[PDB]
Each structure stands twice: as structure tokens, then as C-alpha cells.
Amino acid sequence: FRKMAFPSGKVEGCMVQVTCGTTTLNGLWLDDTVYCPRHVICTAEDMLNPNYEDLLIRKSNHSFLVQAGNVQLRVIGHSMQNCLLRLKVDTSNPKTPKYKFVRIQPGQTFSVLACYNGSPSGVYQCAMRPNHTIKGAFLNGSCGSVGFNIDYDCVSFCYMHHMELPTGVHAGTDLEGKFYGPFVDRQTAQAAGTDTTITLNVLAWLYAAVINGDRWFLNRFTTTLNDFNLVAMKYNYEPLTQDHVDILGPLSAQTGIAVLDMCAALKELLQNGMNGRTILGSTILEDEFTPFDVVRQ
User: Fold this and answer.
1) Residue of 36, 42, 126, 143 with catalytic role
2) Which of 177, 186, 182 is nearest to 28 (CA)?
3) How many domains does the chain have?
4) Alpha-carbon radius of gyration of the chain
5) Same domain, 221 and 283
6) Which of 259, 260, 3 has its CA nearest to residue 126?
7) Is residue 147 within 8 Å of residue 138, measured between CB atoms?
8) Selection from 98, 104, 112 nearest residue 15 by Cα
9) Is 143 a catalytic residue?
10) By three-state DSSP, how is residue 219 classified?
11) End-to-end CA distance of the chain
12) Which of 153, 180, 207 is the last residue in one of the domains?
């Protein structure tokens, strides 16, 4: 089970790769400026406690290699803007669209173009969590990928990938290099409260299993929002409200299974083990996919 692999869109031609030292991450090539996370200029040791103003001082134009497929873009200038590294190149991207930069909020759905080894691997739909992190396996290894919205003729860039947290959740900035949430580009222990499981998604994913063969976890038990939330608080699941039950409306209608009886299925799935059994070819309960991602059957 995956999110839908949307076509790379207009942004495909904006994606480049930047190399400093022995690190390579994705960049965004608009006009004659390349943007990428500033932590590219860091070695592993630097990342522990970096003075970015001092480290850039020990760098020049030649420290960077900008790669557009098998084409090189000569670096003619470098500067720093917050957590973004800015690179002046000697030609402008002929495919630069009509674009604006903007800061968004959690809840807002935007499109992220993925990359495997710096190679645009289709666009993905997503939104930032209330804690400003992103859940999305498609971003694993895909450092430097940008988020955007295509509104009419305009491309509104709102996000750039910086950090993967050990909890499998992703931190980033807007296109001014300002981090969403309290996160920083210097690897420390900053994953507190970032690994509490989203309940709405698990249920939605369990519904995705029902109308797809897997049914073994369905039970003849009853639970209230109250008695479930006590179980939810025990196993570090987000408290389930009425809004979330209202979201799962059409999903419960298609399956015929009641929402609270689906929670009773989840309760026993959490209180018991999973015996090495499988739900949608998975041994772990997934919370990566929103109910809207299940509106894709």
C-alpha cells in the first residue's frame, strides 16, 4: 500500500543536485539561483555543533557542484539566508515557472516532488502535522525536496525538506529557510512528542484493509470514545474526537462496519500483539496515510 504517484508536473525541470564535500542533496533551480539546505556544507562532525557563519567563511564558489542531470551549472556566488544556502549560477533555468514564495500552516495540503538519488520520482500529496512534521516514507533519503501548490498559472513553493528524524518523521523550512516548528539544522535530540501515533490514519488504513481482503482483526466488542481514549493514552495514540469519526463517514458507509466497532478492533490490536500476522502486507499499524489517501480506494 502506497500514496498515489502523481506526475512530476512543472517542477520536474526545477530540480537540481548540489554537492559540497562528500554530501549531495536536491536543490531548487529558479532563475539563476539554486536553493538548498545549508547543512550541505557540513561534515558529520560539523553537524554536531555548527557555526554556519564561520563554516561558510571556509568555503568558496568552487566548494559547490550544481548538477542538472549530466549538465554542470557553474557557481558564480554563494550566500546564506536563514537555513537556506543560496547559489548564484551563470545561466537561468529556461523552465522557471511563474512562482511566488509563501509560508503555510499545518492541515494545508500541498504537493511534494520526491527524488531517488536526486532523480524526480513523482509528486506526492501531503500536509504538515499539528507539530509541523511530515509523515511520508516517500521522503526517506529525499533530502532537499520542495513542497508547492500549483494555482492556475502560478507555482507557490511553501516547503523544503531538511531533516529526517529517527522517529520516521520529517522536518523542513519554507522557501525563506525558516523552519516549521521548533526544529534546527544541527542533529540533536529533537524528536520529543513527534512519535505519538495519529489514530485517524490507523483507522482509515484499517478500513483500507477491510475492502481489500484482510478482515481477521474484526471483533464483536463495544467501546465508547471515553474507554478507547484511555487505551489510546496508554499506547501513545492521539485522542480521538468526534470530528475524526465524522471524517470516516463515507468510509464506514462503504464497508458497513461501525466506527466505534472498528475502534474495538484497534483496541484489541493494541492490547494483544500481532502474532506476525499481516494487515495489508504489513506487521506494523500504519498512520502515514490520511483518510483522503484512502479516497483512492
Assistant:
1) 143
2) 177
3) 3
4) 22
5) yes
6) 3
7) no
8) 112
9) yes
10) coil
11) 11
12) 180
Cell 500500500 locates to 1
Residue 266 to residues 17, 26, 143, 205, 227: CA-CA distances in angstroms? 43, 39, 34, 11, 12
All three cell numbers of 273, joined, read: 500483539
- Amino acid, res. 292: F
163 within a domain of the structure (yes/no): yes
Domain end among 67, 90, 113: 90
Backbone angles phi, psi at 232, to 5 degrees: -60, -40
User: Which entry of 14, 20, 36, 39 is annotated as an active-site residue?
Assistant: 39
Residue 66 bridge partners (DSSP): 18, 73
Distance (Å, whole) CA 27 – CA 284: 33
CATH, residue 112:
2.40.10.10
| Long-range Cβ contact pairs of 11-15 (< 8 A, separation 24 or more) | 11/97, 11/113, 11/120, 11/123, 11/146, 11/148, 11/155, 12/113, 12/120, 13/93, 13/95, 14/93, 14/95, 14/96, 14/97, 14/146, 15/113, 15/115, 15/118, 15/120
A 10 A CB-CB count for 184 gives 15
Q: Cell for 288?
A: 502515514
Known active-site residue 62: no
Resolution in A: 2.5
Torsion of CA 239, 103, 69, 6, to 10 degrees: 50
Q: Which domain holds residue 247?
A: 196-297
Q: At what angle do helices 259-271 and 225-234 cross, to 10 degrees?
A: 30
Experimental approach taken: X-ray
